[PDB]
Amino acid sequence: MLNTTFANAKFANPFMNASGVHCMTIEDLEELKASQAGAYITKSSTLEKREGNPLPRYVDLELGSINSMGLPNLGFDYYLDYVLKNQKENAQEGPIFFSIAGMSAAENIAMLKKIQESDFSGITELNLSCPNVPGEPQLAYDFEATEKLLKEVFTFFTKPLGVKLPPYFDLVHFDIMAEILNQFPLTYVNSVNSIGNGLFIDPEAESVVIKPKDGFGGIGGAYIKPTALANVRAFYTRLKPEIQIIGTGGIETGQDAFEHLLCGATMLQIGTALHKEGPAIFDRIIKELEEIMNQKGYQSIADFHGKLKSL
Amino acid sequence: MLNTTFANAKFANPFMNASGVHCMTIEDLEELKASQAGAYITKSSTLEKREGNPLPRYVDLELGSINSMGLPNLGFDYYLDYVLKNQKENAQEGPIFFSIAGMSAAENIAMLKKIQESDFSGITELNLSCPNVPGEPQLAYDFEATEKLLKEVFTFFTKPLGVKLPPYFDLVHFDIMAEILNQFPLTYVNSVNSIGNGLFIDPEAESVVIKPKDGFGGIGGAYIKPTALANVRAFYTRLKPEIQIIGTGGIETGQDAFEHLLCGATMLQIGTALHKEGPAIFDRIIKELEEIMNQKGYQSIADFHGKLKSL
Ligand SMILES: Cc1cc2nc3c(=O)[nH]c(=O)nc-3n(C[C@H](O)[C@H](O)[C@H](O)COP(=O)(O)O)c2cc1C
Ligand SMILES: Cc1cc2nc3c(=O)[nH]c(=O)nc-3n(C[C@H](O)[C@H](O)[C@H](O)COP(=O)(O)O)c2cc1C
Ligand SMILES: [Mg+2]
Numbered sequence: 001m002l003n004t005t006f007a008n009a010k011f012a013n014p015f016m017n018a019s020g021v022h023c024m025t026i027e028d029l030e031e032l033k034a035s036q037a038g039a040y041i042t043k044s045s046t047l048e049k050r051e052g053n054p055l056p057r058y059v060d061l062e063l064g065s066i067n068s069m070g071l072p073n074l075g076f077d078y079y080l081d082y083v084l085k086n087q088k089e090n091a092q093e094g095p096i097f098f099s100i101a102g103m104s105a106a107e108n109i110a111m112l113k114k115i116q117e118s119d120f121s122g123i124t125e126l127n128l129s130c131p132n133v134p135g136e137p138q139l140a141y142d143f144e145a146t147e148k149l150l151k152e153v154f155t156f157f158t159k160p161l162g163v164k165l166p167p168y169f170d171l172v173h174f175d176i177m178a179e180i181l182n183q184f185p186l187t188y189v190n191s192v193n194s195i196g197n198g199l200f201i202d203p204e205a206e207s208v209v210i211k212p213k214d215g216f217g218g219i220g221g222a223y224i225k226p227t228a229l230a231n232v233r234a235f236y237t238r239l240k241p242e243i244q245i246i247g248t249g250g251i252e253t254g255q256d257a258f259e260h261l262l263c264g265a266t267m268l269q270i271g272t273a274l275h276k277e278g279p280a281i282f283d284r285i286i287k288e289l290e291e292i293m294n295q296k297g298y299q300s301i302a303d304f305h306g307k308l309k310s311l
Numbered sequence: 312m313l314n315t316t317f318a319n320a321k322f323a324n325p326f327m328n329a330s331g332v333h334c335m336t337i338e339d340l341e342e343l344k345a346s347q348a349g350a351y352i353t354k355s356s357t358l359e360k361r362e363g364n365p366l367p368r369y370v371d372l373e374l375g376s377i378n379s380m381g382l383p384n385l386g387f388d389y390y391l392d393y394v395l396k397n398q399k400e401n402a403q404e405g406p407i408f409f410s411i412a413g414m415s416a417a418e419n420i421a422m423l424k425k426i427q428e429s430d431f432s433g434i435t436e437l438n439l440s441c442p443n444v445p446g447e448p449q450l451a452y453d454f455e456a457t458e459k460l461l462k463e464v465f466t467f468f469t470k471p472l473g474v475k476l477p478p479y480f481d482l483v484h485f486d487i488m489a490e491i492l493n494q495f496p497l498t499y500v501n502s503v504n505s506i507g508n509g510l511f512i513d514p515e516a517e518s519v520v521i522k523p524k525d526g527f528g529g530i531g532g533a534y535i536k537p538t539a540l541a542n543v544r545a546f547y548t549r550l551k552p553e554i555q556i557i558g559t560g561g562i563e564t565g566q567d568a569f570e571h572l573l574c575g576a577t578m579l580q581i582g583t584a585l586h587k588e589g590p591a592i593f594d595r596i597i598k599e600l601e602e603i604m605n606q607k608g609y610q611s612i613a614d615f616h617g618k619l620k621s622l
């Protein structure tokens with residue numbers, strides 16, 4: 001009942017891991033492939049392998065999580081080699097997603113050029129919102145810089161491309177971003193990356209709980225669902241139909257998934273909840289969403305996709 | 312134990328209501344005066360009385376609240392007359408706070424001029440984050456416009472003035488705002504107003520829960536504490552000491568209060584929790600904070616104010 005069409009491709013269900021979670025190594029990726037996830041995405045990569053920030057850099061919270069990973073990854077070549085080898089096997093229903101988060105525009109352009117030149121037939125996700133890179137301002141909050149980068153990207157990148165965006169909190173910003181994005185042959189927008197630079201404190205120790213950036217880190221989980229849903233919905237009503245949406249943020253139960261789909265998301269990514277539960281979460285959440293649909297008499301996501309009602 | 316000095320004034324404790332909550336009418340204000348709150352602030356006013364947005368416009372949530380009130384208020388003159396009359400009575404320890412949220416710069420300047428010319432001896436709070444006039448942004452998200460307005464304000468306003476700010480999520484933005492604010496003789500910064508334009512959905516009815524703006528509203532409560540604490544802390548380490556901070560966001564327990572104070576807040580405002588519990592919350596939270604201090608052997612807020620530790 002969850003069969004989904006996205007980026008002109010067929011997926012068994014809309015669920016995927018969120019980049020950054022359970023996708024660092026080939027072993028992680030293989031575990032996602034073996035799981036019930038409809039699709040999966042690689043850890044955002046940089047040209048060079050990165051160790052990331054000092055530990056502790058991730059902490060589970062009652063209402064979600066806080067992290068300042070620092071883009072730890074095994075390097076662009078590592079992930080490209082994996083997806084290219086995996087592609088030849090045809091042992092998977094649906095293309096693999098490849099995330100890139102260059103440390104500079106030049107780095108992103110370089111990686112996109114390599115992807116374009118390679119035989120990669122999957123989907124690419126350009127991360128314009130990493131809030132845990134020491135000394136690096138979320139690009140998607142700089143509308144001028146974002147438009148400039150995308151214009152250069154589309155002068156040569158012809159393969160499926162989506163952008164991972166930070167959350168917006170003002171309607172005028174959604175209007176501005178939508179206007180910018182609508183001029184490009186983008187495949188999708190993925191809302192949202194973590195609510196940036198939040199803080200969690202241990203009152204007993206009177207200290208922060210993560211080492212990097214004096215304790216400031218990206219917030220995920222239940223804390224951000226209202227923001228995530230709003231971003232998915234705001235873009236759904238502003239983006240041209242050619243640009244689909246991936247909903248990310250606060251997805252833990254079938255109900256959370258249902259809500260994102262009602263807003264207009266086509267694919268759904270799970271970060272914090274997957275980090276805590278492991279790949280078994282996909283089978284659980286799929287069944288929860290199916291139960292919700294059965295109760296409502298729905299046999300397809302199309303029966304409610306984007307049908308959120310206003311009062 | 313909780314005696315606090317702020318804006319060169321003495322307060323019995325740091326707790327106050329957050330503007331917008333329990334401060335619409337004279338009766339509301341009198342109830343806050345009768346409560347254990349160390350100080351209180353009036354509902355953000357506009358030159359003319361406003362009915363606000365259509366109902367439902369406020370909804371209690373498990374993790375906080377969502378609202379799109381629409382600035383309902385009894386008008387500038389109503390609040391000015393109240394504060395001017397109570398001022399003469401000298402029946403209160405600590406000045407009253409007066410919030411203004413004009414829908415245009417011209418409106419804010421007009422109200423500030425009236426306050427300046429009046430005999431008002433209290434503290435004024437300029438709201439630069441009420442998600443007010445469509446085609447906006449929240450003024451404080453427009454750094455250029457914010458600096459321009461403040462420059463004009465300080466060419467004539469000599470009375471105590473603080474600014475109510477929206478939450479920021481990127482360190483560069485804190486740097487930019489701090490640079491702007493540090494050039495003025497501002498009394499304080501109040502972080503934060505609601506996380507803007509969030510969405511809450513009733514999965515059963517497949518609809519939003521508030522009538523205005525297709526269900527989009529400001530998020531408050533537990534959802535926003537990480538963001539609130541981060542904003543208080545980020546400004547505490549960037550603002551010149553002359554500009555103090557009022558911490559607002561997710562304060563429900565003595566522990567939440569303790570955390571805000573550890574970050575650097577001097578005064579504390581309660582919104583959502585006060586909306587749900589009523590003025591009795593002040594006595595409860597004061598006792599909770601005092602218990603925390605007693606356990607740690609602290610007899611003054613100075614024993615831990617702004618002492619949040621990094622790892
Ligand atoms: C440990 C961790 C690492 C992350 N690293 C990335 C990353 O490399 N690339 C990216 O686009 N998002 C990254 N994110 C953000 C997630 O993809 C997701 O947008 C966020 O966690 C919001 O979803 P959630 O509420 O399900 O956690 C990371 C999140 C976590 C918790
Ligand atoms: C019903 C309601 C009305 C509000 N109206 C105002 C307002 O007029 N002026 C203002 O500065 N903030 C207003 N706010 C925001 C609060 O002052 C406060 O910044 C926010 O609720 C975050 O605090 P909390 O987590 O304790 O709710 C309002 C909040 C609520 C819940
Ligand atoms: Mg599988």
Ligand SMILES: [Mg+2]
Pocket residue numbers: 343344345346347348
């Ligand atoms: Mg009193």
